[PDB]
């Protein structure tokens with residue numbers, strides 16, 4: 001098996017988890033220690049269902065930029081037994097585009113699912129169901145409901161978290177390493 005498949009399957013084993021909130025099914029990315037990230041609209045509460053058990057949430061942070069604009073990412077500290085494998089080194093230091101990225105999804109409904117979104121380009125502002133959002137990127141792929149939280153990856157780099165689409169295109173919140181320092 002080659003390196004790209006190996007890397008994505010290793011994410012799925014160690015960092016990319018099937019979850020459920022009151023809003024439904026999402027992919028969760030565990031980044032390090034007991035810190036994970038989810039799309040803001042998943043609206044995690046005091047507890048979250050992770051794979052096979054209810055986990056308590058000790059803290060949630062909704063990220064906004066200096067202008068007070070939604071970034072569509074919530075950082076959760078979990079009451080988990082184990083630390084996540086630390087993947088902050090794979091998250092670029094600034095929001096980065098990519099070529100021929102793969103969207104990796106892991107939900108009870110869409111388990112271990114690989115979506116060939118293709119090139120990922122700068123997009124910036126995005127009106128997400130009436131919510132103004134910054135620091136997004138775009139792929140010309142018809143992504144669908146249930147894919148939010150999906151991890152946008154390319155060549156060993158973890159660069160986005162899927163957050164929406166319009167039936168022709170998909171958008172992610174961009175990831176940068178400072179979010180998890």
Ligand SMILES: *[C@@H](CC(=O)OCC)[C@H](C[C@@H]1CCNC1=O)NC(=O)[C@@H](CC(=O)[C@@H](NC(=O)c1cc(C)on1)C(C)C)Cc1ccc(F)cc1
Nearest residue numbers: 041127128129131143144145146147148163164165166167
């Ligand atoms: C993932 C969450 C989900 O499944 O919720 C159940 C509806 C989902 C992925 C997209 C659905 C269709 N295609 C997808 O890939 N995300 C959402 O539903 C968010 C909202 C959207 O994606 C909306 N799209 C846009 O607003 C938009 C704008 C442009 C230029 O292109 N698309 C559509 C449903 C209209 C959920 C969300 C996020 C943030 C919010 F504040 C509210 C809702």
